[PDB]
């Protein structure tokens, strides 16, 4: 290490270990800097020797990494803790820590009521959080001009592979409402990941078709058996048909192979009676769980059956609740001998079979017991559909995070660029200790976006030139609007004009990243005295 070598035990007794900490602290945050923002480089990282990981997420990077110092240690928590918060702000919290812990001690050492020093880095977070609660100036999915449409359209402009954001602005609107699940505090916000979403190759590259009710993907082209009668009903089954062994409990060990062949012979033929019990109930569309053997399949192909099998249970579960059906009612056993009662029937205006794209789905029109939707994605291929689907997801969580918190900020350190000089100003008249802290605080803010800038090769001089120009006493004002531009696009690394974009972040992860950053200033400092052990 540095300075005195006289005592082991990571006791360098003051500035040495403190600097050996700021060294370690400035050592760990480095990967994050190059990894900061979507323009953060993607790090192939050797796990053992030939064992490697390619990751641009510092937190993920940190998780493979080990902590060789408390300085290395205290950040890899708070970073992974801010990762544990969301995963928005992982890289954010990391860097500023390395600056403040040479900043933090310098004041708190001088005592004179030693308690309150690092609160100069805390009250600043408060001062920031307030302002951070004040920023609709950039990043609005709270309302756009088309609201969640344009909010997603600008978010589909935030992730944009094409003119997508035309139907895809609407899909994300369709998506948040497609999902209906109990969400608490009263949220009409419903999770955006569970949205039933299907990929369609061919037709138009950029296009979407919203399914009334949830769209159940049901197997066609493998089972040639008709599942199709246009109906008002669906029988939602959690049940399986097998022509090899439908109900087990037989041992290959028994001296009699007849016992395994017998229930095989018998219970292979009961598979096609179960449906006849369901059809006679009035069910002309019966949604059955799959798992038939490749032999049992072609048998079910050549022997034939009336049923809808190998449906998506993610949709089947959603549709069971949606159409009012259950997936299990009278099913006490693996035997196809079981009768069927209408309890597993879903109720709908009609259940009509629409095969589109050369993919037949179970499309439940008027899912009765909830509101349901699924937006199928028309693209050249499913990779082209993979292309826009991911572009849709960051039109989702942003709306979601906005539906999580109406108050937001623009993502990135651009909110600092305002706050920083303001908080350095908010430090100025404080004077004494307090002009130091809040300014020594706010100067350490600047590292995040500028590093993120040069991560995009944005000439970080530019990033500060643009933002803190607009930031003034003229504009101290986030307002709700732009008389200054406090926004920073992260995949751009440069402030853009997008005030709705889906690549920003709400006030949620940002009020957090402040304190965690103030924490690492404190987090290393609690030790009283020092020693060494034998």
């Amino acid at each position: 290490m540095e300075g005195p070598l006289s005592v082991f035990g990571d006791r360098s007794t003051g500035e040495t270990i403190r600097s050996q900490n700021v060294m370690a602290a400035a050592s760990i945050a480095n990967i994050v800097k190059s990894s900061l923002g979507p323009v953060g480089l993607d790090k192939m990282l050797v796990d053992d020797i030939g064992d490697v990981t390619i990751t641009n997420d510092g937190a993920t990077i940190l998780k493979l990494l080990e902590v060789e110092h408390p300085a290395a240690k205290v950040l890899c928590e708070l970073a992974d803790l801010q990762d544990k918060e969301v995963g928005d702000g992982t890289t954010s919290v990391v860097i500023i820590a390395a600056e403040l812990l040479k900043n933090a001690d310098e004041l708190v050492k001088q005592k004179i009521h030693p308690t309150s020093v690092i609160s100069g880095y805390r009250l600043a977070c408060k001062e920031a959080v307030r302002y951070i609660n004040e920023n609709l100036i950039v990043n609005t999915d709270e309302l756009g001009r088309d609201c969640l449409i344009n909010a997603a359209k600008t978010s589909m402009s935030s992730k944009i592979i094409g003119i997508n954001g035309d139907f895809f602005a609407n899909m994300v609107v369709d998506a948040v409402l497609a999902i209906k699940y109990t969400d608490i505090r009263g949220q009409p916000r419903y999770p955006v990941n569970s949205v039933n979403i299907l990929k369609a190759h061919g037709r138009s590259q950029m296009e979407s078709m919203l399914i009334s009710g949830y769209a159940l993907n049901c197997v066609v082209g493998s089972q040639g058996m008709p599942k199709r009668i246009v109906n008002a009903k669906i029988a939602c089954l959690d049940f399986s048909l097998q022509k090899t062994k439908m109900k087990l409990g037989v041992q290959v060990v028994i001296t009699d192979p007849e016992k395994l062949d017998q229930i095989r012979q018998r219970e292979s033929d009961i598979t096609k009676e179960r449906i006849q019990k369901i059809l006679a109930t009035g069910a002309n569309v019966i949604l059955t769980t799959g798992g038939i053997d490749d032999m049992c399949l072609k048998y079910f192909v050549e022997a034939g059956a009336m049923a809808v099998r190998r449906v998506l249970k993610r949709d089947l579960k959603r549709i069971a609740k949606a159409s009012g059906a259950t997936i299990l009612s009278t099913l006490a056993n693996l035997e196809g001998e079981e009768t069927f009662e209408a309890a597993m029937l879903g109720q709908a205006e009609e259940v009509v079979q629409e095969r589109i794209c050369d993919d037949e789905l179970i499309l439940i029109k008027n899912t009765k017991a909830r509101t349901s939707a699924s937006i199928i994605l028309r693209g050249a291929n499913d990779f082209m559909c993979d292309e826009m689907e991911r572009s849709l997801h960051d039109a989702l969580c942003v709306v979601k995070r906005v539906l999580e918190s109406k108050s937001v900020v623009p993502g990135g350190g651009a909110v600092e660029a305002a706050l920083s000089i303001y908080l350095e100003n908010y430090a100025t008249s404080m004077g004494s200790r307090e002009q130091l802290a809040i300014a020594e605080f706010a100067r350490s803010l600047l590292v995040i976006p500028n590093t993120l800038a040069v991560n995009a090769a944005q000439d970080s001089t530019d990033l500060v030139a643009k933002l803190r120009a607009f930031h003034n006493e003229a504009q101290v004002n986030p307002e709700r609007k732009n008389l200054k531009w406090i926004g920073l696009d992260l995949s751009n690394g440069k402030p853009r004009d997008n005030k709705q974009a889906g690549v920003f972040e709400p006030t949620i992860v940002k009020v957090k990243s402040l304190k965690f950053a103030t924490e690492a200033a404190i987090t290393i400092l609690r030790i009283d005295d020092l020693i060494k052990l034998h």
Binding site: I31, K43, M295, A457
Partner: protein, 513 residues
């Protein structure tokens, strides 16, 4: 633990390996050839034209070379060829770009140039990509023999032409989805040992080496019907687990034999039924398999269901509990040829299958058991065309005039695209022309003047179709010369190549774990 690496230092280490790897094989690849000879610490020499064969036999450096083996595989994973191209091609763009461009300072358009340098390939290729008849063995043969020659081999080419020209057309998945481009299980090449070139005997369908393995088995039943288990084999895989006795020494011997005497009684249960073939995924033991053969019942053993299923569809085999017990028989014939070929007394049962799930496992016979391995590579490189031609009739002629065709169209478009962007785009414009120029530097004289003549030839005469001869160095029409550079291959090459070099820049850092 935590480890940090930075800047040019790793990216220069990225530059080194792949580029240094790109040296010998670029001279090796193409008709102009060399050999990369590994020195084992004992003095053991291993000389190939595949560096990835040499790279593994010794330390693979982490920064460039660890990713290059995989982009070596990925190319050979996809089309069945091209380990040696992508590496030198990625080594090209890796070499001159970043430092120069990072001395011009930016990671961004560097990465961005790969895109727009990649599509100019896609752009100028498919324009000058020459279509060839996919129904014509020959119109495919001239492009297939061009791609069977990947290193030295035109020898099995014409013979690997005929088999693949036949096979990939019949290729279908078990989905049978499309023909054409395919997985190598839906087109398989299993080299069959021994014989001679006359036994090569094109096989368009799956083969079962386990269908008839013995002379005592089923002899040439035109449509083999494999009966799956289910009753013909009633299910006992278990063991009696009879109690211990110290008096008889035979009880030690008999209890283990009990395992395989069950399938024996199950094979006895088969005999009564006489399935001409029997398939068992549980497997049948050989002490059980005695009684199947003498029935003139061949036995496919230790094969999975999908192996059988595709075949049971391909050989058109009724899949039933018993032949006399109705499981609803599958068809009697799915195939037109069942050929059981014998090198030695181990019989090789080949069922030629026309547009069936099958495997399309193709028969090849070298003069002996050895040169098979190249025929398979020849056939795989052959079937690659036949899956590429049945995909792309248009595939660029070039001696690397294609490797110029992009490069010069890039510098043309460098003038069009401009910005600071052009300079990477103009820098990456250079990297492509080196591979063939090396091959015509392998020729001699002034290879850059030939390249100048190329460039003079390029926009004036033609990009690629008309081009330079690779081994001669003359400027000639490469369809007229007959050298074919498959579109997909080229399409795959830079694509696979631009991808890795993107990350090699993106990685300035590795950790220790």
């Amino acid at each position: 633990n935590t480890k940090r690496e930075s800047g040019r230092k790793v990216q220069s280490g990225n530059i080194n390996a792949a580029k240094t790897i790109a040296d010998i094989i670029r001279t090796c690849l193409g008709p102009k050839s060399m050999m990369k000879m590994l020195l084992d610490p004992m003095g053991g020499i291993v000389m190939t034209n595949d560096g990835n064969a040499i790279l593994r036999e010794i330390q693979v450096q982490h920064p460039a070379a660890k990713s290059m083996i995989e982009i070596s595989r990925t190319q050979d994973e996809e089309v069945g060829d091209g380990t040696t191209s992508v590496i030198i091609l990625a080594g090209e763009m890796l070499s001159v770009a970043e430092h120069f461009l990072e001395q011009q300072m930016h990671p961004t358009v560097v990465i961005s140039a790969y895109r727009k340098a990649l599509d100019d390939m896609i752009s100028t290729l498919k324009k000058i990509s020459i279509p060839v008849d996919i129904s014509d063995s020959d119109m495919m043969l001239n492009i297939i023999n061009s791609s069977i020659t990947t290193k030295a081999i035109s020898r099995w080419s014409s013979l690997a032409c005929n088999i693949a020209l036949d096979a990939v057309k019949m290729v279908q998945f078990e989905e049978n989805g499309r023909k054409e481009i395919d997985i190598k299980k839906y087109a398989r090449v299993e080299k069959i040992p021994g014989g001679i070139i006359e036994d090569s005997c094109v096989l368009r369908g799956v083969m079962i080496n386990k269908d008839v393995t013995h002379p005592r088995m089923r002899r040439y039943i035109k449509n083999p019907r494999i009966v799956l288990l289910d009753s013909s084999l009633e299910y006992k895989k278990g063991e009696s687990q009879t109690d211990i006795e110290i008096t008889r020494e035979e009880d030690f011997t008999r209890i283990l034999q009990m395992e395989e005497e069950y399938i024996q009684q199950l094979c006895e249960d088969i005999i009564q039924l006489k399935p001409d073939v029997v398939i068992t995924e549980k497997g049948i033991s050989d002490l059980a398999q005695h009684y199947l053969m003498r029935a003139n019942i061949t036995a496919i053993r230790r094969v999975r269901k999908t192996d059988n299923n595709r075949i049971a569809r391909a050989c058109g085999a009724r899949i039933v509990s018993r032949p006399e017990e109705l499981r609803e028989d599958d068809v009697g014939t799915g195939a037109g040829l069942l050929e059981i070929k014998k090198i030695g007394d181990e019989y090789f049962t080949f069922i030629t299958d026309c547009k069936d799930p099958k495997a399309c496992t193709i028969l090849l016979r070298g003069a002996s058991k050895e040169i098979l391995s190249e025929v398979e590579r020849n056939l795989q490189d052959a079937m690659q065309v036949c899956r590429n031609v049945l995909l792309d009739p248009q595939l660029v002629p070039g001696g690397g005039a294609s490797e110029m065709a992009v490069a010069h169209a890039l510098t043309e478009k460098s003038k069009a695209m401009t910005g600071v962007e052009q300079w990477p785009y103009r820098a990456v414009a250079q990297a492509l022309e080196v591979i063939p120029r090396t091959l015509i530097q392998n020729c001699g004289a002034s290879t850059i003047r030939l390249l100048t003549s190329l460039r003079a030839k390029h926009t004036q005469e033609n990009c690629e179709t008309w081009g330079v001869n690779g081994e001669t160095g003359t400027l000639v029409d490469m369809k007229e010369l007959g050298i074919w550079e498959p579109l997909a291959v080229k399409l795959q090459t830079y694509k696979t190549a631009v991808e890795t070099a993107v990350l090699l820049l993106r990685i300035d850092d590795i950790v220790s774990g």
